[PDB]
């Protein structure tokens, strides 16, 4: 008639906690005999059988703006980017004054000759060499009106470290897996705002293939949405929170380049050599990118018709960024080991007033949007603690036939009685891409012990 304490093993209860995570990669990336993909060879091989168990009738709170997986992702990418340049060449003796001039043959705009002198195997003798450095990597140091003295940009701040000429910067997928005694709750709701309750939560060992691309403004290769466009924001009231738009129908984007000569090898010490741009064989053409016109138009129209839900009696507008330097105001990414920084002025030129304009013309697919841009070599990413990379050039022509999946916008300062507020592309920190990728998941700790009062009593 009384009650006695009974211990239960295997009780399904959760606790919110933070822990370190594994690494999982496919077995097809281990066949390459050259060490590459920024050291993604030490991960345990994932099983070829993904297990996903759906929970019955439970709800769960979710918050992606205060998450531990995003911070661990950012710290892992920072530390592994800093680790891959340790045995590489240091660009210490390239701080010499560069006697630069325009080439005699042709115009060759956006490049300068910049011939210097460097030490041989003897510390006494020095020999003259030449290269072809890009225009944004060259700073005119000047005490008078001298139009020939130039120096390297990264010899003024820090670092001066070359990338090794054997690794690749391709985005190989990785999976973050919780250890034993931990699980990952994943929300499968199609209308997930980003913060709040979820009614279709499922327990998961670990995630899908996460592509760690490097991008600003627009978002490169990644997972799509499920049903419609989905808009995420922290507060959606202030003008300092970067709003994320997650698309449903991708838009094809390609990028090209002209032809370089080769990687001219210049020796600057015992064993340590660097590869610069030699001559240029062919013509001089701009390095551009192409995006389909009608796909971008009705994609931005769908973004307009669903961004008008939160602003029902207002019209939206688009323009460029509000000024700044090169690295923040331009959509920047990587392809084939070459970095691209391109303005998006022709992509954010429009407005939506609440009226849908259909485009029923199958014979007008010829029109495309072009984006003209330049290429940097000395790289200052992460906005600090970056250990500035000198990317070596690539000999042949390169192509970046890719996929677009998301947009990073930011509101402006809205004046009083305004109904035509504008949205601008945003740069910011690198946490936003992985936060847009790790929205579904939350790490959790299971506790398999419990107590309960029962009618059972042990034998005396």
């Amino acid at each position: 008639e009384n009650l006695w304490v009974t211990v239960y093993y295997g009780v399904p209860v959760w606790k919110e906690a933070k822990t370190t995570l594994f690494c999982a990669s496919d077995a097809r990336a281990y066949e390459k005999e050259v060490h590459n993909v920024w050291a993604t060879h030490a991960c345990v091989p994932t099983d070829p059988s993904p297990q996903e168990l759906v929970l019955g009738n439970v709800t769960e709170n979710f918050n992606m703006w205060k998450n531990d997986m995003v911070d661990q992702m950012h710290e892992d990418i920072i530390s592994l980017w800093d680790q891959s340049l340790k045995p590489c060449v240091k660009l210490t003796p390239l701080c010499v004054t560069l006697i630069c001039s325009d080439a005699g043959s042709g115009g060759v705009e956006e490049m300068k000759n910049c011939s210097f002198n460097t030490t041989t195997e003897i510390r006494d003798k020095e020999k003259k060499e030449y290269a072809l450095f890009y225009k944004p990597d060259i700073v005119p140091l000047s005490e008078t009106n001298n139009t020939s003295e130039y120096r390297l940009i990264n010899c003024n701040t820090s670092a001066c470290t070359q990338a090794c000429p054997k690794v690749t910067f391709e985005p190989i997928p990785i999976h973050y897996c919780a250890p034993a005694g931990y699980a990952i709750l994943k929300c499968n709701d199609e209308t997930f705002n980003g913060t709040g309750p979820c009614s279709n939560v499922s327990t998961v060992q670990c995630t899908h293939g996460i592509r760690p691309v490097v991008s600003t403004q627009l978002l490169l290769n990644g997972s799509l949405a499920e049903k419609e466009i989905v808009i995420r924001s922290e507060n959606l009231t202030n003008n300092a929170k970067i709003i994320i738009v997650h698309l449903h129908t991708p838009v094809e984007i390609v990028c090209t380049r002209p032809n370089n000569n080769t990687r001219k090898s210049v020796r600057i010490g015992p064993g340590q050599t660097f590869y610069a741009t030699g001559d240029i064989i062919g013509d001089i053409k701009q390095a551009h990118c192409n995006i389909s016109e009608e796909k971008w138009n009705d994609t931005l129209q769908k973004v307009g018709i669903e961004l008008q839900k939160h602003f029902p009696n207002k019209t939206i507008k688009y323009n460029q960024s509000a000024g700044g330097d090169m690295e923040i105001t331009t959509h920047s990414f990587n392809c084939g080991g070459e970095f691209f920084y391109c303005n998006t002025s022709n992509l954010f030129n429009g407005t939506y007033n609440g009226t849908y304009i259909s485009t029923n013309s199958s014979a007008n697919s010829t029109s495309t949007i072009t984006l003209q841009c330049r290429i940097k070599q000395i790289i200052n990413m992460w906005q600090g603690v970056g250990r500035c990379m000198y990317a070596p050039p690539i000999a042949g022509n390169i192509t970046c036939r890719s996929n677009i999946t998301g947009l990073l916008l930011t509101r402006d300062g809205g004046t009083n009685s305004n109904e035509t507020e504008t949205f601008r592309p945003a740069g910011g920190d690198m946490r936003d891409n992985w936060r847009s990728e790790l929205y579904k998941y939350k790490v959790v700790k299971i506790e398999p012990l419990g107590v309960a009062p029962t009618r059972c009593k042990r034998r005396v």
Partner: protein, 123 residues
């Protein structure tokens, strides 16, 4: 059926699925994290095993203990407890009185062991 088969089900319905929910407790830059997760899994499994092994319930699910249940912990009848409430909110309201319960089972187990010692030494 692996992790969390009936995590939001009835209290009495979770008793028949305990044999399949607690089966997977053990089954450079990215080498240190693997080592730390490995050691942490070892710590969790060994702590769980010894804590289940102090009060004489090693390797046995649904273990019965002769310590009386005080009415100051729940003060509500067992019928609606075992057919109305899930595990999570029950764990939320029991979490303030776990150390006293663990001490009571430890003292009861040790007194039981001393009683068995005296009983076997009486012969």
């Amino acid at each position: 059926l692996g992790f969390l088969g009936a995590a939001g089900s009835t209290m009495g319905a979770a008793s028949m699925t305990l044999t399949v929910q607690a089966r997977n407790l053990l089954s450079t830059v990215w080498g240190i994290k693997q080592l730390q997760a490995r050691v942490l899994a070892v710590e969790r499994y060994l702590r769980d095993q010894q804590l289940l092994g102090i009060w004489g319930c090693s390797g046995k699910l649904i273990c019965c203990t002769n310590v009386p249940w005080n009415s100051s912990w729940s003060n509500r009848n067992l019928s609606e407890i075992w057919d109305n409430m899930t595990w999570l909110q029950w764990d939320k309201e029991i979490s303030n009185y776990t150390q006293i319960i663990y001490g009571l089972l430890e003292e009861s187990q040790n007194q039981q062991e001393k009683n068995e010692q005296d009983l076997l030494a009486l012969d």
